[PDB]
């Protein structure tokens, strides 16, 4: 079926070039779908268009006027991919980058996972995870709550799951905040029955792909 | 250059029709498209061909063309719809596609009170030379809320940070985390650590506290 897979998070130094890949499944890049588009989301700029690539007959590539002189979209017909290569990056290029397909005359249906790019000169750091343990002589009433604290990591992208993703209900993974240290802090939380506080194990699985870090931490009273 | 002009915000109450508009100078031609952005994940196509509903979208979502000004009308709005909406089309000669700034649907709905929780620092953090105290608020609609950290019955300023969760979509309520960052020395000084929470849904400020070493 038609599935788009983007690359991992990126930390690019402020004067260097950004390279991103979108791999397709279930259809041919060369078909007459003719969208194979790249886009980005910035905190206050919003959804901005970047570029296009069409079909084999003649591989047309048309980019936005805003970023035309730095961007380049390159299909790879061997690997069934299309790439984004952005030159002379700027700290204002920090955003979340997506890739999309269009059925032709009628949509931008299929989207990618997203890619968080950080335009900074800072070196990568891995996080420290700490339990936010449940109260035990107090938990009652509005049920029980527990969590994990991810601290002191850069760049921003970290992904947190619970019990290898078995919980996925009541989870509130919070937006990260940059601290006075110049590092990021995030907190994942779950609300669970006060009865299952000893009969069921709760473990948060953190992955900081930029640091190639993957940790699992159990939260217990 | 080419531009698609769209409002910045839109507000309505549940079960009430909302009408977002997007004006364009090339929309007389080139058809049009709509997308939704719930923060945290990729966009979602809500309407295409100016009125053609894709599958999977609620029947409340619909749109007309009206020539140069296209619109998205959402009847019987449910609260799960609070999101940022975007209009897209393409220029004459259709060789460069464009986006709008984006409206923010508000769907003012209900008032839920937070479920307040306090989390003391882990000793693992204390082996490092710092401490972080967590006050959690769960499932309240008005994002506006106070936290008022207290340590020795002494309010503090500039020592904490806050973060709100946006759309769990189970109830679509907000949740907040206030974290007080402190030194291990300053933490092992004092004894009481409490947060007082004020919200529209609470009769009086609720306080959750803990004593170090208990």
């Amino acid at each position: 079926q038609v599935q788009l897979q983007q690359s991992g998070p990126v930390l690019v130094k402020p004067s260097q070039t950004l390279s991103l890949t979108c791999a397709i499944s279930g259809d041919s890049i060369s078909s007459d779908t003719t969208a194979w588009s790249w886009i980005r989301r910035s905190p206050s700029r919003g959804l901005e268009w970047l570029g296009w690539t069409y079909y084999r007959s003649k591989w047309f590539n048309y980019y936005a006027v805003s970023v035309k002189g730095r961007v380049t979209i390159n299909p790879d017909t061997s690997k069934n991919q299309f790439s984004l290569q952005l030159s002379s990056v700027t700290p204002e290029d920090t955003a979340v980058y997506y890739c999309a397909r269009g059925n032709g005359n009628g949509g931008m249906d299929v989207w990618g996972q997203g890619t968080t790019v950080t335009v900074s000169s800072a070196s990568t750091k891995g996080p420290s995870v700490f339990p936010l343990a449940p109260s035990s002589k107090s938990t009652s009433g509005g049920t029980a709550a527990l969590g994990c604290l991810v601290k002191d990591y850069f760049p921003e992208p970290v992904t947190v799951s619970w019990n290898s993703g078995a919980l996925t209900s009541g989870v509130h993974t919070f937006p990260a905040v940059l601290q006075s240290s110049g590092l990021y802090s995030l907190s994942s939380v779950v609300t669970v029955p006060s009865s299952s506080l000893g009969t069921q194990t709760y473990i948060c699985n953190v992955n900081h792909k930029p640091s190639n870090t993957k940790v699992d931490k159990k939260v217990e009273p | 250059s080419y531009v698609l002009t769209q409002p910045a915000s839109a507000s309505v109450s549940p079960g009430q029709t909302a009408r977002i508009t997007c004006s364009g100078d090339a929309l007389p031609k080139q058809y049009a498209y709509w997308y939704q952005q719930k923060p945290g994940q990729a966009p979602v196509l809500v309407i295409f061909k100016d009125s053609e509903r894709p599958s999977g979208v609620p029947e409340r979502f619909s749109g007309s063309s009206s020539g140069t000004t296209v619109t998205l009308t959402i009847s019987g709005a449910q609260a799960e719809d609070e999101a940022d909406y975007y209009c897209q089309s393409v220029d004459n000669s259709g060789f460069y596609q464009v986006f709008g700034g984006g409206t923010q649907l508000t769907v003012l709905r209900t008032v839920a009170a937070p479920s307040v929780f306090i989390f003391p620092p882990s000793d693992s953090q204390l082996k490092s030379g710092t401490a972080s105290v967590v006050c959690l608020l769960n499932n309240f609609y008005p994002r506006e809320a106070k936290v008022q950290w207290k340590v020795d019955n002494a309010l503090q300023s500039g020592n904490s940070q806050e973060s709100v969760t946006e759309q769990d979509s189970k109830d679509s309520t907000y949740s907040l985390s206030s974290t007080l960052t402190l030194s291990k020395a300053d933490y092992e000084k004092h004894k009481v650590y409490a947060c007082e929470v004020t919200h529209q849904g609470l009769s009086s400020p609720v306080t959750k506290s803990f004593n170090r070493g208990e």
Partner: peptide
Amino acid sequence: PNPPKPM
């Protein structure tokens, strides 16, 4: 040198 189908 033309785009996908017009309106």
